[PDB]
């Protein structure tokens, strides 16, 4: 019969954009360790979780402008029994600031391009955010944007302002964001002003939700008697050939007749008629088989075949 006591010196500390570290220490007054104790952590706000852990520290990626709050408890499992202690608790308050002082409607967008130097094919990722100023913001207030990807945090260098000073957009032509990346992008927007505190605002984006896939390039259509050969190239991206879904759209400008084919290869053979001008476009997305569902590209520019 053992009697479990809660962990002690439970603290939360901010270690970077939308990132914290929970720590605690085993209870000095615990029935001596000859049994291995573990911990149960429960995140209470802003976004619920619990999970068990086996050491006395835990990282959590989370939004902070709403304040964060967490609890931890000690547990002991074995043959015939589970036991768990009362909880310790801790929280960070929401940052200081009036309600409408805060940035609103932040959208962020990623896109890939190719380094046309370096002798070796690697790629580059830009980032582009916009937001609006929020209704209570005082006239003199200035907003600043920071981003984080994995261990690298940068502050925005080149903004775009509304017609009286205030930053409303940001652009990074390069970043430390990996293309094929599978981690969260965290964005923070601070502010300041003569006449009071400004509420920060942060959020977490998943890359697949904001990566503006590039259209296919070099779509070619060769019309031969009655068959049309369409062809295109893999979009500019760091996902390999076998990772794309395409939609090919063939449109008869003579009568309206429309054909769209979804497929994973780079070529398509469609039967056609010989008295029409057709326009053909192609669209692209990366396969749910390589990453979670994201966005479709624009359609390539119309090319025309037939008379």
């Amino acid at each position: 019969k053992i009697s479990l006591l809660p962990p002690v010196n439970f603290t939360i500390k901010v270690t970077g954009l939308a990132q914290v570290l929970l720590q605690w220490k085993p209870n000095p007054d615990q029935e001596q360790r000859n049994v291995n104790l573990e911990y149960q952590v429960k995140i209470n706000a802003p976004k619920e979780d619990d999970y068990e852990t086996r050491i006395t520290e835990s990282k959590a990626v989370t939004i902070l402008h709403m304040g964060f709050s967490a609890s931890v408890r000690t547990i002991l499992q074995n043959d015939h029994s589970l036991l768990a202690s009362s909880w310790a608790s801790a929280e960070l308050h929401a940052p200081p600031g009036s309600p409408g002082t805060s940035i609103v409607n932040l959208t962020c967008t990623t896109n890939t391009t190719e380094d046309n130097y370096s002798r070796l094919r690697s790629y580059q990722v830009s980032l582009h955010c916009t937001w609006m100023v929020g209704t209570d913001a005082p006239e003199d207030t200035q907003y600043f944007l920071y981003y984080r990807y994995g261990s690298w945090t940068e502050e925005c260098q080149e903004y775009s302002m509304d017609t009286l000073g205030r930053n409303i957009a940001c652009w990074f032509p390069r970043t430390f964001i990996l293309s094929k990346g599978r981690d969260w992008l965290a964005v923070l927007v601070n502010g300041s002003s003569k006449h009071s505190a400004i509420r920060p605002f942060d959020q977490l984006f998943a890359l697949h939700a904001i990566d503006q896939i590039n259209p296919p390039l070099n779509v070619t259509a060769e019309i031969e008697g009655t068959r049309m050969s369409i062809q295109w190239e893999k979009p500019v991206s760091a996902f390999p050939i076998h990772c794309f879904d395409y939609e090919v759209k063939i449109h008869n400008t003579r009568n309206g007749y429309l054909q769209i084919e979804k497929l994973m290869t780079n070529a398509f053979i469609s039967i056609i008629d010989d008295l029409s001008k057709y326009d053909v476009q192609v669209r692209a997305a990366v396969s749910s088989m390589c990453r979670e569902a994201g966005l479709w590209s624009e359609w390539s520019q119309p090319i025309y075949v037939g008379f």
Partner: protein, 109 residues
Amino acid sequence: PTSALVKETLALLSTHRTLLIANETLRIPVPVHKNHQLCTEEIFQGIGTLESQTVQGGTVERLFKNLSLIKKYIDGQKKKCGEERRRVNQFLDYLQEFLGVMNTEWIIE
């Protein structure tokens, strides 16, 4: 081998989600970082425990089989690491390959 497999076992995973995610008391090891490949041993023991926990009626049985073949492939890749002894200059090249990579494309806490 096993190209065909994965793509199919993904949508299989997708359709059997609500069923799998129904034991809310169950806890499985999940890495805290994204170098997935360092963690296959854990990833596979979690599937094992999931599998012993979930009722073996339906097309779900197929999801597990599939995961077990993927398991086989990975086991084989792993045996290929220590299979073929070679001259030192060879091993050094590997090492420097391994170090470049560890450098350009792993996150680092």
